């Protein structure tokens, strides 16, 4: 089950 | 540590450190950067973020990884070590809600930072629930669910319903809901209304906000075939 | 830092610690287990020699990362930024060179364990090089090139031309030919001919040598590709 | 140009 990866920005 | 660095420097050096992928170092320009005392733009809320949770992703790998060799093995080593990694792990988290808590949730008064820094506090204290042991995981639990709530509950009133943030907010409340509160049928529920009620209002935007609500979208959409 | 921790312990730790990809960990605990004073197994010889790559390795990737935008850029921030990455860097490999001559070479009297130190001395004083500017490299070039010399010396008096070790040296010191000291002739005749003698080497070997030897062969073979 | 990864062991 996957969260926002939000590991780029 | 960074206070004689200027303001635009840390956020200079903070999004240098990203192209490098020095995570830890771009957290700690982050860090300073909010102690300057000033809100924070929608790309410099992004990069503190971004930053975190590349710190905290890495962290909770290396738990996973100690905590399923030290199940199997049940000397101290194991346990130390993945001792050692989880009281590291709960220091980052602290330091995140601690400038969450001094002060940008105060000071944000617009819905999108308001329900940005609410997400980031739901999921840090998802992140010391995933670690937490007995009673003490009730409480976090429970401060982890009062955080996503109060940003559904804004979001709801003040976006719409493909705002890539409350897109995102909703998919790491339904995994709460699967993965700590052990309510799948309510994971479920939550990722499904808004997978539906973002395709409904998809006809409203151009085609750059479409690919940016459409890949959160399918994100809810990997998840619920994962859980169905 | 690990002085009260067993030796056994660090060994045992900096195993998990590359299991859960905590490299800086895995550098710590192996540091604190050279300076027990004793000599380091060919096990052990190898965690030393991985940690410390994976850390140089992700600080020189970040260096090159940052001279790459400071070299288009020509405020202060990215020179500054490259040099607190470069400081760093050279501090890792300083702490390295300094386990090296304190004292694991002088207490090295095999072959094997002597080999795989100085193939360890030539390659920090090479990261150093790829760092340094002017006269300062021309020292620390010729300190890289005396470490891989002597390697060298021994690893053809007594070792087979397929052992891994003598293998990866001359891969190493052709390197440094080619990316250092600007004699690509020098690294194209030292891949070549250290390539064809292991070949020759081959017959002698067991299924499992013959794919040890064979897989560095290739990294010789990938080279003298991309260098002819 | 590569050297040794030795990354992993
Ligand atoms: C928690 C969360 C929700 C949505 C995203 S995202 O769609 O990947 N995105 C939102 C903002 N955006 C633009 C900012 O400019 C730098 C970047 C990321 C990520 C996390
Ligand atoms: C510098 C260098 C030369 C060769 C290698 S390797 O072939 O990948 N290899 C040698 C020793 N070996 C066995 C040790 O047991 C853990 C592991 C790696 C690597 C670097
Ligand atoms: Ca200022
Ligand atoms: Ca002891
Ligand atoms: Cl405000
Ligand atoms: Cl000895």
């Known amino acids: 089950a996957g969260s926002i990866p939000g590991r780029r920005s | 540590a960074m206070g004689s660095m200027e303001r635009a420097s840390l956020i200079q050096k903070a999004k240098l450190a990203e192209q490098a992928e020095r995570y830890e170092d771009m957290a700690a320009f982050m860090k300073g950067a909010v102690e300057k005392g000033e809100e924070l733009s929608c790309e410099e ?5 971004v930053a975190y949770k590349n710190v905290v992703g890495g962290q909770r790998a290396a738990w996973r990884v100690l905590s399923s060799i ?44 308001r329900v940005f820094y609410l997400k980031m506090k739901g999921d840090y ?22 955080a996503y709530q109060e940003a559904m509950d804004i979001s709801k009133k003040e976006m719409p319903p493909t705002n890539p943030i409350r897109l ?16 799948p049928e309510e994971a479920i529920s ?8 973002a395709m409904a209002d998809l006809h409203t935007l151009s085609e750059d906000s479409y690919k940016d609500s459409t890949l959160i979208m399918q994100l809810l959409r990997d998840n619920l075939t994962l859980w169905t």
Chains 1, 4 share one sequence.
């Open chain 2, 70 to 113: 030290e199940q199997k093995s049940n000397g101290p080593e194991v346990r130390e070590y993945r001792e050692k990694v989880e009281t590291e792990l709960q220091g980052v988290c602290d330091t995140v809600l601690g400038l969450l808590d001094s002060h940008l949730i105060k000071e944000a008064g617009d819905a999108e930072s």
């Open chain 2, 125 to 146: 204290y998802r992140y010391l629930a995933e670690v937490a042991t007995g009673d003490d995981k009730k409480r976090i639990i429970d401060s982890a669910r009062s």
């Open chain 2, 45 to 49: 809320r992004n990069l503190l973020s």
């Open chain 2, 168 to 183: 995102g907010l909703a998919l790491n409340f339904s995994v709460f809901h699967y993965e700590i509160a052990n309510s």
């Open chain 2, 190 to 197: 939550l990722a499904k209304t808004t997978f539906d009620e």
